[PDB]
Write a protein that binds this ligand. Structure first.
Ligand SMILES: Cc1cnc2c(NCc3ccncc3)nccn12
Length: 289
């Protein structure tokens, strides 16, 4: 760490505080994240998982039994950008470009059997060139996913897939497609899709919009560990009501990204081929740094 000069704190991640820092030598500006052999090995694997839509893991510093992860620095996150674009909303072509890029990032990670597991606007980082990138990829498998960050800040449930909430132990890459569908809806409507404030409130918000899942739409759901026959039975709502005024192509894709059955939920690779992206472009966001 003597090689870095902390410039400022840019947030408190799930596994520790993140600082903007400068390499005392190269002068390179980076994000320094202050955090077992298994964890060390897993994190080490992440260094090779490189893609233009995945925030680059530059190095890992393991000292005094303390862990620091050195990342590429980006100037803004999607949560801030959305708050800033609240009055007018993010233009559709930009939402479309961001979604397309994030799907490319996911398709890449998923091909290497690596899941993110905790996608949320705070871990989607953007630059002036119109790129968006996934931050903290793989850290959940490496260290695990807690309920409260080292800062005691409640870990958001808003983007959690229903199979996780229902106790599935061996969930899949489909969990990241669910999260991204939630974020896609939020960019379009300017409001979180399922802002649950407890595990049961999160599940019930999902059920109220998508209908209470049953064996018809999700074979095996009633056997899941945390499924209860006493759950209320709510009817499904039309997506025309959920994400107006998204067009039919967007509503169709969002529907496949929010399918209950993880086996049937669209993959990142298949989503890239969806008609919604026929006219995709790469606009530049107007960032105020
Ligand atoms: C791993 C990582 C790389 N860049 C960021 C990042 N950048 C946004 C920002 C920049 C400056 N001040 C506040 C937030 N936020 C969180 C994590 N980050």
């Amino acid at each position: 760490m003597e090689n870095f000069q902390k410039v400022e704190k840019i947030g408190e991640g799930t596994y520790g505080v993140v600082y903007k820092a400068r390499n005392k030598l190269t002068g390179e500006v980076v994000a320094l994240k202050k955090i077992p052999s298994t964890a060390i090995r897993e994190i080490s694997l992440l260094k090779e998982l490189n893609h233009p839509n995945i925030v680059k893991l530059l190095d890992v510093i393991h000292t005094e039994n303390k862990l620091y992860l050195v990342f590429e620095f980006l100037h803004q996150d999607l949560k801030k950008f959305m708050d800033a674009s609240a009055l007018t909303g993010i233009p559709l072509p930009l939402i479309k470009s961001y979604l397309f890029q994030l799907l490319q990032g996911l398709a890449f990670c998923h091909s290497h059997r690596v899941l993110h597991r905790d996608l949320k606007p705070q871990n989607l980082l953007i630059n002036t060139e119109g790129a968006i990138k996934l931050a903290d990829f793989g850290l959940a498998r490496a260290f695990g996913v807690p309920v409260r960050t080292y800062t005691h800040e409640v870990v958001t449930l808003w983007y959690r897939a229903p199979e996780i909430l229902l106790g599935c132990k061996y969930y899949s890459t489909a969990v990241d497609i669910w999260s991204l569908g939630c974020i896609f809806a939020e960019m379009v409507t300017r409001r979180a899709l399922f802002p649950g404030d407890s595990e049961i409130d999160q599940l019930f918000r999902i059920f109220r919009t998508l209908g209470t899942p049953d064996e018809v739409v999700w074979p095996g759901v009633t056997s899941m560990p945390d499924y209860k026959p006493s759950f209320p039975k709510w009817a499904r709502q039309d997506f025309s009501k959920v994400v107006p005024p998204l067009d039919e192509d967007g509503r169709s894709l969002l529907s496949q990204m929010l399918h209950y059955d993880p086996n049937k939920r669209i993959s990142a690779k298949a989503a890239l081929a969806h008609p919604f992206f026929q006219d995709v472009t790469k606009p530049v966001p107007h960032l105020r740094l």
